[PDB]
């Protein structure tokens, strides 16, 4: 669905409240506040870090 905040990974506005573990229906990123705080931290709610996930999404 449309939301009001950008997904940290894909940038599409699918998020209602940042840092509340919403899962993006476009790219699959789970909005874990740890992983937006540290974009190089792997193994949070998502296996990839945010930076890893961003690159993976873009290369599709």
- Per-position b or e across 26-38, b if 16+ CB within 10 A of its CB: ebebebbeebbee
By CB under 5 A, the residues from 31 to 60 that bind Fe ion are none
Q: Does 51 bind Na ion (CB under 5 A)?
A: no
Question: Encoding tokens for residue 40?
Answer: 């190089």
Q: Is 27 annotated as a binding residue?
A: yes
Binding range to Fe ion, per CB under 5 A, among 2-10, 15-23, 32-40, 45-53: 2-10
Residue closest to 33 by CA, chosen among 4, 8, 11: 8
Summarize as ranges the residues that interact with Na ion (CB under 5 A).
11, 37, 40, 42, 49
| Residues lying near Fe ion in the complex (CB under 5 A) | 7, 9-10, 24, 26-27, 29
């Amino acid at each position: 669905n449309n939301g009001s905040y950008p997904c940290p990974c894909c940038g599409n506005k699918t998020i209602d409240e940042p840092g509340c573990y919403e899962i993006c229906p476009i790219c699959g990123w789970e909005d874990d506040p740890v992983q937006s705080a540290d974009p190089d931290f792997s193994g949070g709610a998502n296996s990839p870090s945010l930076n890893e996930a961003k690159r993976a999404f873009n290369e599709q």
